[PDB]
Amino acid sequence: ALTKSQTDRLEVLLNPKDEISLNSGKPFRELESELLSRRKKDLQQIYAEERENYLGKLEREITRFFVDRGFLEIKSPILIPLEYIERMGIDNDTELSKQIFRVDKNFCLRPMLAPNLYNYLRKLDRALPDPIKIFEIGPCYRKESDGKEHLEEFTMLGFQQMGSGCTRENLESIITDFLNHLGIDFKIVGDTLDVMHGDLELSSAGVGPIPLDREWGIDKPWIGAGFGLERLLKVKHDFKNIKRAARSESYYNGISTNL
Amino acid sequence: ALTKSQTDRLEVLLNPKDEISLNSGKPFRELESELLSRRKKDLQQIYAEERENYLGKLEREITRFFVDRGFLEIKSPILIPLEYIERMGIDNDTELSKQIFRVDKNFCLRPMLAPNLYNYLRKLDRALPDPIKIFEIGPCYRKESDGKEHLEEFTMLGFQQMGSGCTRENLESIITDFLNHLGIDFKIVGDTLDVMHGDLELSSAGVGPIPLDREWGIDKPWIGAGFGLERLLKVKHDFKNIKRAARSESYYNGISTNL
Ligand SMILES: Nc1ncnc2c1ncn2[C@@H]1O[C@H](COP(=O)(O)OP(=O)(O)NP(=O)(O)O)[C@@H](O)[C@H]1O
Numbered sequence: 001a002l003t004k005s006q007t008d009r010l011e012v013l014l015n016p017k018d019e020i021s022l023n024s025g026k027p028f029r030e031l032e033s034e035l036l037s038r039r040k041k042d043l044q045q046i047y048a049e050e051r052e053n054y055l056g057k058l059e060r061e062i063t064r065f066f067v068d069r070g071f072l073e074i075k076s077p078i079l080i081p082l083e084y085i086e087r088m089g090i091d092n093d094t095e096l097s098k099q100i101f102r103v104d105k106n107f108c109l110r111p112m113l114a115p116n117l118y119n120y121l122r123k124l125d126r127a128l129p130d131p132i133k134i135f136e137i138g139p140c141y142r143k144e145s146d147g148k149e150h151l152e153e154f155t156m157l158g159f160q161q162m163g164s165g166c167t168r169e170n171l172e173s174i175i176t177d178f179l180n181h182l183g184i185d186f187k188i189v190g191d192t193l194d195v196m197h198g199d200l201e202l203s204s205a206g207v208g209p210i211p212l213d214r215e216w217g218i219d220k221p222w223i224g225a226g227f228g229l230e231r232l233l234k235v236k237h238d239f240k241n242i243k244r245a246a247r248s249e250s251y252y253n254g255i256s257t258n259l
Numbered sequence: 260a261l262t263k264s265q266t267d268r269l270e271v272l273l274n275p276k277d278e279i280s281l282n283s284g285k286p287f288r289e290l291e292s293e294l295l296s297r298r299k300k301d302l303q304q305i306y307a308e309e310r311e312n313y314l315g316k317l318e319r320e321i322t323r324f325f326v327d328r329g330f331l332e333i334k335s336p337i338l339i340p341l342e343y344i345e346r347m348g349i350d351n352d353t354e355l356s357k358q359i360f361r362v363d364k365n366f367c368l369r370p371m372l373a374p375n376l377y378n379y380l381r382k383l384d385r386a387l388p389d390p391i392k393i394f395e396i397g398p399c400y401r402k403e404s405d406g407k408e409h410l411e412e413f414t415m416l417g418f419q420q421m422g423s424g425c426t427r428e429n430l431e432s433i434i435t436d437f438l439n440h441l442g443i444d445f446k447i448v449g450d451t452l453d454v455m456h457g458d459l460e461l462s463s464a465g466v467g468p469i470p471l472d473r474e475w476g477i478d479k480p481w482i483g484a485g486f487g488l489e490r491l492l493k494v495k496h497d498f499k500n501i502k503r504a505a506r507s508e509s510y511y512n513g514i515s516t517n518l
């Protein structure tokens with residue numbers, strides 16, 4: 001019989017597509033030698049044929065999608081003024097207030113894209129025609145309890161349209177086309193709405209105006225949504241734990257690097 | 260005559276390609292109205308035609324280049340254990356020790372890619388054939404004095420080859436092909452070498468083995484280099500200050516967003 005520790009080790013080495021039964025009575029040392037061999041070949045094939053990282057590749061695919069549909073690609077600071085958090089209505093009452101990674105006296109690691117997108121919408125509205133369509137992909141940081149669905153360092157897609165066409169129907173049509181294009185199953189439940197894969201939250205979307213808009217100098221209708229890229233990789237690759245999709249030293253494209 | 264403040268305002272609005280003389284005796288309010296109009300049209304053209312961000316686009320171009328030449332694309336944590344810094348030989352004697360953004364008791368924002376690349380080289384050497392070729396693009400953080408060439412939040416390309424072919428000639432050939440492919444003028448001065456554009460440092464490269472390798476479990480020859488992506492955009496777009504190339508709310512593709 002295998003120990004819990006030995007099975008822990010075997011499951012790090014196991015890929016969702018693997019047809020191997022741990023429970024069959026073969027010895028740990030041999031099961032481990034089989035899986036070690038498969039995982040080295042998986043890396044060898046990636047290195048020989050494609051060489052692209054899942055997270056980077058997904059970011060590039062999402063980028064082409066939104067560029068093609070008319071959204072301006074934004075890259076804004078990751079390290080943001082701590083006052084952007086209070087101005088988002090997060091002031092020691094919300095769960096998120098205690099999730100902030102603080103950096104100096106006045107800065108933090110952004111936990112969300114909304115502040116920077118707000119600022120870009122206000123600024124670009126003096127220069128661009130209606131409607132204004134922007135999106136950003138990049139790192140976000142939140143302290144979390146260990147979870148199968150949570151990382152402290154993750155990657156968020158955020159997009160926002162401001163002006164005409166900001167209806168809930170249009171927002172659902174963007175979400176629907178976007179996830180059908182990546183091959184990710186979902187249902188939309190709900191102005192605020194959530195995009196869910198079973199009990200896993202893929203995204204939270206919203207329809208404005210809302211009263212928070214005036215703190216940021218926004219007085220137009222808008223629609224938007226945020227998606228976590230690692231949750232999407234988790235679903236499309238059927239990973240059991242989101243840390244196989246994360247920026248990490250322990251996993252490459254969901255294959256363990258401790259061989 | 261224009262005030263220093265009025266010329267400051269005019270130069271934020273001025274693009275390197277602009278053929279405008281501030282010194283000609285026309286009034287601030289009119290010079291500003293001309294430049295405001297040009298800068299809005301620049302944004303309108305980007306929004307109508309391409310919609311890609313300079314930093315993101317450069318990252319994708321560098322990615323294709325290195326993937327095509329056989330380097331595995333890495334995305335590793337940005338928030339790293341503070342002990343990686345001491346293990347890099349930075350222990351309160353180097354300039355870099357005081358440039359570290361510390362996050363908790365035990366973590367920091369990475370100022371460099373070398374620790375994570377080291378760890379990937381050691382790990383992948385059990386699985387991949389010789390030579391091992393990897394690269395990473397992503398955020399790095401250093402506290403800096405205000406400068407025309409320094410950002411506190413920048414983007415670094417790092418690449419490393421381990422094993423056979425790790426000669427200084429091969430390393431120069433990668434650097435040379437890489438910068439000729441992006442259209443960036445340089446000279447290599449020097450095993451440690453620097454890639455310079457005038458007095459601006461584009462990159463620092465190195466040839467191993469070096470004694471530091473054994474702390475990281477490396478005992479093979481290697482070659483590598485690090486490049487700052489914003490320094491490259493600065494040179495190729497002839498920006499005067501690197502903050503036009505940075506992830507920012509003040510500039511989009513080097514065009515001011517305060518119109
Ligand atoms: N810690 C995290 N790790 C990975 N993805 C995350 C994390 N937090 C949020 N996301 C993703 O970012 C999206 C938008 O953020 P948001 O709706 O504010 O998250 P959330 O409400 O905290 N979801 P959750 O914390 O799981 O109940 C979410 O729908 C997730 O897909």
Ligand SMILES: Nc1ncnc2c1ncn2[C@@H]1O[C@H](COP(=O)(O)OP(=O)(O)NP(=O)(O)O)[C@@H](O)[C@H]1O
Nearest residue numbers: 401403408409410413460461462463485486487490
């Ligand atoms: N603060 C910064 N802002 C932008 N790019 C940077 C910064 N620091 C380093 N880089 C880039 O990263 C490359 C590799 O890092 P490194 O050689 O350690 O920098 P460095 O020695 O501090 N250069 P410098 O500080 O300007 O004298 C450099 O050659 C630069 O192109």
Ligand SMILES: N[C@@H](Cc1cccc2ccccc12)C(=O)O
Nearest residue numbers: 112113114158205206224225226
């Ligand atoms: N709330 C997340 C996701 C997000 C990004 C941008 C716009 C959003 C609009 C509605 C709901 C979520 C949105 C964030 O602030 O990053």
Ligand SMILES: N[C@@H](Cc1cccc2ccccc12)C(=O)O
Nearest residue numbers: 371372373417464465483484485
């Ligand atoms: N020293 C920088 C640039 C760099 C990255 C990777 C490998 C390197 C090798 C030699 C010199 C610099 C290298 C860093 O640690 O990120």
Ligand SMILES: [Mg+2]
Nearest residue numbers: 095096142144
């Ligand atoms: Mg949460």
Ligand SMILES: [Mg+2]
Nearest residue numbers: 194201203204
């Ligand atoms: Mg939510």
Ligand SMILES: [Mg+2]
Nearest residue numbers: 354355401403
């Ligand atoms: Mg320096």
Ligand SMILES: [Mg+2]
Nearest residue numbers: 453460462463
């Ligand atoms: Mg240097």
